[PDB]
Design a protein around this nucleic acid. Structure first.
Ligand code: MG
Ligand code: MG
Ligand code: MG
Ligand code: MG
Ligand code: MG
Ligand code: MG
Ligand code: MG
Ligand code: MG
Ligand code: ZN
Lengths: 57, 83, 116, 178
RNA sequence: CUUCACACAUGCUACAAUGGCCGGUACAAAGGGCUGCGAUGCCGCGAGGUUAAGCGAAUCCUUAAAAGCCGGUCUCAGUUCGGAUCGGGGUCUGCAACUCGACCCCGUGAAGUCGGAGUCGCUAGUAAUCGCAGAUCAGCAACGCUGCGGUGAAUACGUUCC
């Protein structure tokens, strides 16, 4: 049951446009997964009406 | 008066009624008919009896109604529903 | 080609493909593509990821798009309701707010004909 | 050797003893299993969960899922007993640490308009459950070979006794909480 | 006097490719102007602001007509069709624009894919379509009304029936 019923699963390199690169084991064919955003370059990971009248006058 | 070149519009008879109370720090109600007056940030905390057509309606200027006209809080018409 | 989490329609010219972002119409689409130098007569399938970085960061420095435009829009409607203004009461009932005629029309704010 | 595991025993295994003063190293919490399931309730009708829920959770997680049948018939759901309504995979060992690292690095920020996960979704022991809303969170499935979009909810079952002990574990692994 | 569970009536803009958008370029008529018409220059994405020439006018301003033509692009999709509704920012008029003004910018992008029974106008420079002007008027709910020119059809056997 742990033989030729499961999908193929081997080593896979992941790179980001920020410059991040690390090495996992995934199911992408060829092992060349490329992301546009990751855990290093995303926001949330690093970050009155009285003044409206004052700005007009 | 609605264009930024000429400032906002408050009636002069309404500006004199709060400047006699901003000088001695009291919060008496201002009976008024001036629905067309802008709320400015010297009306904060003041209450106003604002005429709607048939009676005067109290309105309490808090902080966020400070770019609006004063008549927007006394509704003139009345409609509960057809049935 | 996800730009700001928006999934641009594939095989579409770049002047129109940016307008599928909530917060960008045709005037902003001309001035995203003017500051970044990407030409307007370009399909979105021929886009470069090096080009996609140039306009995935021009937008947060200047513009206001999905989520934090959509919540700023629905917190302005929210603001009028608790201050008890005229438009806030008029927002609460599904009646039109900008001084519209309500005798024979306003079938956009209201639904289809109830027909009593 | 998955890199989230060698990072776990290097500093996470030792920082938890100084926050929670354990006497013995057999008390330090560790995530035991990650369970993902679909829950395709719109498969009692039309009976198509074959390409839908089975063939994408194999691509997300790495092994073929189990199909879960319904246990009692509910009339209002048009649900008959013994009918496939759920698809579930269970991840242990290296495929678990290679899922949690791949989830938090390149997948969990791909949520549209993402502002973090709630830290109050612990059940009382220190097991965390959150729900995804789309399949396009993962690059390992593609938008063009799939049927209709569907979400999934993901359990992270730990060896923790209580909630803030389990909250301190997943914070140290790299879950983003608001 | 502008309300709004609804019903009718007259119109406008639509549902697109005989079209939309962008660039270039051609050809009108009849009117208005002193509490005015504002050329030119200058600032603004724009409505506009400012300066000021000329003109009670076949003289100056209004005044760039729009369809059309040529080039480019979209490629039949609820879309680069549609432009309601709503959010924000403005300008001008006026003592004053909340109830209740018009216009401009940015965002938003609803119904609608040619319309049931029924029903209307039109026989020629007509119908269909395209702009421009006037009166009332501080401004305007002007898509109305009274006019003006542009391009420009198809049909009529016939008198039985309505
Ligand atoms: Mg009347
Ligand atoms: Mg259009
Ligand atoms: Mg043209
Ligand atoms: Mg200029
Ligand atoms: Mg052409
Ligand atoms: Mg429809
Ligand atoms: Mg069509
Ligand atoms: Mg007039
Ligand atoms: Zn990165």
């Amino acid at each position: 049951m742990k033989s030729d019923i499961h999908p193929a699963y081997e080593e896979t390199t992941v790179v980001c446009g920020c410059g991040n690169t690390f090495q996992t084991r995934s199911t992408k064919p060829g092992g060349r997964i490329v992301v546009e955003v990751c855990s290093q370059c995303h926001p949330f990971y690093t970050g009155g009406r009285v003044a409206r009248f004052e700005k007009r006058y | 008066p609605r264009s930024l070149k000429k400032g906002p519009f408050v009636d002069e008879h309404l500006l004199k009624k709060v400047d006699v109370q901003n000088e001695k720090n009291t919060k008496q109600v201002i009976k008024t008919w001036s629905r067309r007056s802008t709320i400015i940030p010297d009306f904060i905390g003041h209450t106003f009896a604002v005429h709607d057509g048939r009676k005067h309606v109290p309105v309490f200027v808090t902080e966020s109604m400070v770019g609006h006209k004063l008549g927007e809080f006394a509704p003139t018409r009345t409609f509960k529903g057809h049935i | 080609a996800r730009l700001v989490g928006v999934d641009l329609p594939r095989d579409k010219r770049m002047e129109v493909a940016l307008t599928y972002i909530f917060g960008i119409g045709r005037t902003r689409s001309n001035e995203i593509l003017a500051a970044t130098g990407i030409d307007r007569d370009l399909r979105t399938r021929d886009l470069t990821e090096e080009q996609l970085i140039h306009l995935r960061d021009y937008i947060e420095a200047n513009l206001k798009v999905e989520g934090d435009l959509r919540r700023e829009v629905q917190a302005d409607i929210r603001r009028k309701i608790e201050i008890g203004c005229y438009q806030g009461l008029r927002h609460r009932r599904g009646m039109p707010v900008r001084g519209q005629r309500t005798k024979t029309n306003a079938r956009t704010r209201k639904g289809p004909k109830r027909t009593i | 050797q998955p890199r989230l595991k060698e990072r776990y025993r290097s500093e996470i295994r030792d920082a938890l003893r100084k926050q929670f003063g354990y006497g013995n190293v057999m008390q330090i919490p560790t995530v035991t299993k990650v369970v993902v399931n679909m829950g395709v309730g719109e498969a009692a009708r039309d009976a198509k969960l074959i390409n839908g829920a089975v063939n994408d959770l194999a691509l997300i997680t790495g092994q073929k899922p189990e199909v879960r049948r319904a246990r009692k018939s509910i009339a209002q759901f048009k649900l008959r007993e013994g009918m496939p309504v759920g698809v579930r995979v269970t991840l242990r060992g290296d495929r678990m640490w290679e899922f949690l690292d791949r989830l938090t690095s390149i997948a969990l920020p791909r949520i549209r308009d993402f502002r973090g996960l709630s830290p109050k979704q612990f059940d009382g022991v220190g097991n965390y459950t959150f729900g995804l809303a789309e399949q396009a969170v993962f690059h390992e499935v593609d938008v063009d070979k799939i049927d209709r979009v569907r979400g999934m909810d993901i359990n992270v079952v730990t060896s923790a006794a209580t909630d803030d002990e389990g909250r301190a574990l997943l914070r140290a692994l790299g879950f983003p909480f608001k």
